[PDB]
Design a protein around this ligand. Sequence first.
Ligand SMILES: [K+]
Ligand SMILES: [K+]
Lengths: 462, 462
Amino acid sequence: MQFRSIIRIVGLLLALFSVTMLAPALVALLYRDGAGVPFVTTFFVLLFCGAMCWFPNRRHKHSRDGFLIVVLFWTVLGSAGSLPFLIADNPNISVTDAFFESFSALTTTGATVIVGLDELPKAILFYRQFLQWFGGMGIIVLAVAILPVLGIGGMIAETAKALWYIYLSLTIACAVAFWLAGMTPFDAISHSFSTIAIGGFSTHDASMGYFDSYAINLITVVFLLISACNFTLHFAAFASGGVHPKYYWKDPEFRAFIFIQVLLFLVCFLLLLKHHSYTSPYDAFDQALFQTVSISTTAGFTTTGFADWPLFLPVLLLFSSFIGGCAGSTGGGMKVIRILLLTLQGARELKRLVHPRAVYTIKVGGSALPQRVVDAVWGFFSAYALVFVVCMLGLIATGMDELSAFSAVAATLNNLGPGLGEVALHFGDVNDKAKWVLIVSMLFGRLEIFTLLILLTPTFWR
Amino acid sequence: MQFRSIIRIVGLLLALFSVTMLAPALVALLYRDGAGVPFVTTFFVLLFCGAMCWFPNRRHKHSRDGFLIVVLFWTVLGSAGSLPFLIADNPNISVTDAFFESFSALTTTGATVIVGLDELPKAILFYRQFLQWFGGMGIIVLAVAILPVLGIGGMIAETAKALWYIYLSLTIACAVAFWLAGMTPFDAISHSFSTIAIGGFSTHDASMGYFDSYAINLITVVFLLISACNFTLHFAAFASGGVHPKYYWKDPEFRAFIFIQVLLFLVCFLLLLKHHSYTSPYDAFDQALFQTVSISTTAGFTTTGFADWPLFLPVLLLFSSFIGGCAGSTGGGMKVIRILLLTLQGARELKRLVHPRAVYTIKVGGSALPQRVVDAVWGFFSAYALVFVVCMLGLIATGMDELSAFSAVAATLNNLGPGLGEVALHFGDVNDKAKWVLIVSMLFGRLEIFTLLILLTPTFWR
Ligand SMILES: [K+]
Ligand SMILES: [K+]
């Protein structure tokens, strides 16, 4: 087991986290407004705690450890990251609310309990976006860095930098475009933070409701679509050539993400027209395209409130939220390939009933899928259902009413952010226990459900 | 394919159905009350249509036919059985309402759209119960009769009579007991019809709310539990003497059904106590014990309205509605063995993550399950979820609101069918399209989802 060498990495990570508190404290002296005293207190207590772990250890005793690591990386960082939200009496908020905000930020869930954030320190807002960006690193270097500790192919740090490039040259390349459709520079850095990590956080209390310019809406769209799609596939970029064209339409995962996106928008738009839910058919186009792309790819950004929207639309959207993101992106539904595979496998299951003496094989690209991963997919989907209904009961038990709890889990297990059900979105004054439960829900939502469930099976130890 | 020999059995069934219209027409002349003109009109149009099918055929050209038949037996009979509810202007009701009532009746769904049935002809009420009883035959002789046409073991009419005996000596043995806790004989036969076929229909508009005597509540409980339990397992009754005892606690399906029932009751009761939802700690026991068994074993009978019940309870009940009935009984959730197996399979999936080079096998009784049935189970669960969310969308689109459509599907896909969500139960005045949707929902719910799904795959033909 050797937790003694695991704690080395934990403390090392706390120090590495401390060196990111100097990032919105450098906005606590730049932008004149508010208080950044906490951020510099935090940079201290964290560096101290972390190094108080790293130093009494120093042992690289390089399975059961890998999981425990990728649960500590969140459980600790998302806990430590609730410290600015505590000492700071600028948005003075409850400890549980602080935790909810920190975890929701770090998970790239994006569901706030701080109302009235439009008028707060330019730092405590920047921290909010920076968290999303930073966790948005984890969620994609953990689609590579796990291999040494864990198994994807158990079911190379060449790409640790090479990914950070695709990420940086995306947030920057977005910031320019955002501030070219005219946000304040601050808002265009802090909204690329949110839009690339597919998180949903904003500076405006109405998210993407500042400037109804189809410029920013239809920018957020294309940068979401880019961000919501398989950084290893993007990796056909720095790998010299810019021979992008064919690689995307090669992989059937992406091909499916595109069919899904198209169909979903199409139906949404067409119903928004049929229903006369928008004055101009153009605004219908806008709001439809932005809402489907944002909500289904696990983004969270809202440009409307579904005022004129037929209930069928926010419901079907909250459902399509279960399928968002080429696997190994910054999204976090039961990722696209999961649904692809699922439909394939079930299709088979329907075929076998007809001719049962027949040999049907699951075909993805060319090679067949093994009956060890099909089992894994099905088991995952089931587990997902379990977790969802369990936390739905947990919320109804917390005190919450039925539909609000349904929306809540459906928003924290996919890591959405919006209530999205029947305009019951706002978490601020929800039950406290509910806040904790929902935090759990988004920890599950991040760890793809299994790598936490196994933590409490006896079989894990030892 | 040869549909030509299929029509023989279809018409033969319309005639066999005609000769059961003389059964509540024999109550339209016995009990002085009401109008039985329809039942004798129906006995004619049905005998005529049926024989107009059987006669121009006569060919016993003894898979895909087995399926097409076991969809015809419901789709045809449940349509034909909507004929009394049409011509009769005593509860004069819309055609779609008539179909809803007939299909819900024959399915053992148990969800009425006729409010105020307390004051109706003693025949049209008896027809309502008789339907449930007759379908309650189908749902258990199709756990035998299918084998020649189809496959359970593709994934003997010795027992065709032998089942009808365990069924008859149960409805009779219940009718007596009901009329010994003092119902009118009519109400004690027509409630054994419903309580054995696990259907949920009643004579009283408040179902089991006539006489809050724990006598009848705790009779209905004990006859539900028996009826809700594996007639093939019961078959250890007529064969040899009363050597029942060991057989039950041998089979782990039943062994699981008992744990489930107990745990469910326990939590329910204990919460009805903690919440002070009942004046005396006796009525708490009563209502808990009756409600868990009724709602979870797919019965439908209600003795309360969940006035003081903590919301957590009707919700958890509506969910436990998904798993009800020893497999091959009169229930119709995703039957108990399914959930047992599912949990086993997922537990396994959770084990493989830890030690991945290991050989884990699924164990039920003694022999392991083959990896052709685990696949089938998982596929079934997935399909189930799919169907549910699809019909929930179909209903939210029909016009219904979100939570109501949810309760509706969750009640018709398992065949409960009380609303049960947050006191929005009553189907009578729901949208008209929605009624059709719900009929589909309960056809799926009856046919275990696959054996109708495959009917619309191209692969089925030919
Ligand atoms: K999000
Ligand atoms: K029922």
